[PDB]
Design a protein around this ligand. Sequence first.
Ligand SMILES: [Cl-]
Ligand SMILES: [Cl-]
Lengths: 362, 362
Amino acid sequence: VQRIYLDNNATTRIDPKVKEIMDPFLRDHYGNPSSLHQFGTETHPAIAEALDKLYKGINARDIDDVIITSCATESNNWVLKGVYFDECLKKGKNHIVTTVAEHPAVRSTCNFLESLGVEVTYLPINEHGSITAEQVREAITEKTALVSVMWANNETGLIFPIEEIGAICKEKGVLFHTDAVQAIGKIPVDVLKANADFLSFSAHKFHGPKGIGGLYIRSGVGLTPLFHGGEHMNGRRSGTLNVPYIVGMGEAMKLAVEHLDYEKEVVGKLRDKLEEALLKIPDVMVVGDRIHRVPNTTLVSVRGIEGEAMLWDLNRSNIAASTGSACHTAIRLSLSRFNTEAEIDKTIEVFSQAAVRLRNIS
Amino acid sequence: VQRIYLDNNATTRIDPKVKEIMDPFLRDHYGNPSSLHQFGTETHPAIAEALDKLYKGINARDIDDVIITSCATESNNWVLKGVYFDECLKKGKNHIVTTVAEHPAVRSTCNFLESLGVEVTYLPINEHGSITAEQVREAITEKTALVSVMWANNETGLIFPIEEIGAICKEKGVLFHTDAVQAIGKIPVDVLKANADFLSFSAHKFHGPKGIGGLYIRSGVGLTPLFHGGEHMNGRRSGTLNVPYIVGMGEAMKLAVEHLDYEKEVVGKLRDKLEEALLKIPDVMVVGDRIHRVPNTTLVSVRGIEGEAMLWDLNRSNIAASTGSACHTAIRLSLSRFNTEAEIDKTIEVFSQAAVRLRNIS
Ligand SMILES: [Cl-]
Ligand SMILES: [Cl-]
């Protein structure tokens, strides 16, 4: 059997290099980095290297923090809850502005916040499949504590106008947070250019392990711990370091950065090829703008014949993809560095055949 | 070189079996358990097995939850913050009772809570090195939302009277939480007998990886998510599952349970041997009760000559141990299934020599 994996915005294969780098931390270097003795100390250099890699990946400065978390969900929670504590309860700034596009980790948190009496305004998506970059301005009520926009959408692949929201944030004096989970390894990420106070990411979206993430926190910006215990991560996030995962994550980030051109030029090309092939079939059209999208994602909708059925069919032939809400759900196909032209060709063939079968059934 | 590791209450070696069990989830079974297709589904059985193992380990019922977290720190935070939301803000029960012995993950959280206007009373430790099991009763003000006692102390090894605090909790109608981090693999743990509503644990204390933990939550007991997103873990704790770690943790728990007799009979014996050897030296005495202690831990204090220096000396000879506050810090030596009689003998010799050297210096 040969399976084809097209669900990369859902999770990704760990890179063999990442695995290799992690291995000795599962085996002999198992000491607690907080310990004083040779085990803990032994862990330091590797950890430092990992951190450096992470920093380079998002163009963070020495003065900034990139705090290791257990996942981007965690990061999101920390950002929102932290801002509620600091800026909402204690400074009366009882408004947050986000988008409707945001990952449930944000949206759900926001809902919870609202249930405590926070006002949250969720910017409606337009026909272009974006936020105007101005709706924010139109909604910064000064009582706004935080603005939170995802860098790229997980369903559509669509890139939002970060950088221009950063300006609208700097001008307005409001805290800016970008969940960047689906940006890493896909497009350049620059926290400086973004004027982000907070950035989220998760390793498993760029060939690291599940179960680890980052929150970038800008110098001098404060955020009340979500994990109190104050022993690790400069007091900001307590809990014994996940050494293996840290190392792996660092490596993954490095690899992601290295493959940016490749992602653009080759993965993107593959995606385009797939998309074009698909569109030469009855009443199947891409959902959203096709220009401001990360290179790896296509979301496509088949006339009548629903998405779930299609997905099931694909699975039956060993091809893995996901749904994406579009308004009938659509079909989300998300490539990686590891797909090949051959695979794409096969997918196209299989997709067409599946469509025809479903068509026949209809 | 041959090093000797006596810092197990700080973190533990991953068991080779655990490593083995995790490996295929780092390699080919890398799909997201939430996905519908063959990758996600493929992950199910293993996950189920892991969960079963976990459940068996703490004598939880089908009706209960054992929620996967990123660490016991996380668990602690979730318990405390959750109870504040549910029971403190919304039901006016603005009191929590804990001990001074508790891990900083609890204590720090409590401090934070207090800073919001929660009243928290921290039970003072006695000369026996325990909580009376009655101080709790004496302090349950009905307005008590939660009682939180660690099952065993990380510094002394001392077991607290859980089960008798459970009764005092059931009788009083108050939520009971036990951080059990240092109990797993050391002594039997039974959430039924404990009448726990909440139990915490962390994998790396029983030969699992760092970066994963559990919170047991009793049937029908509610706790507001610390990670909102409500996609995983029956809505209670969002974030893509750490599949590898989950599997590993399950295995580790199983192994821990299996080795309970061994821990008692053999590890305990080793510890005793060490302790006796040490005590036959000028003005060196064990800190605390020597009867109600987990089998693996001894905390010992050398007249005058401080603990840190001793630790450093030990490290220089390839022997790793930790401090433990005692009142001059004391010396904490914590064995595992992997230490040998030979190693113990060597340690004894080395310890004595080190003492004499320091004595000479004095
Ligand atoms: Cl918080
Ligand atoms: Cl919470």
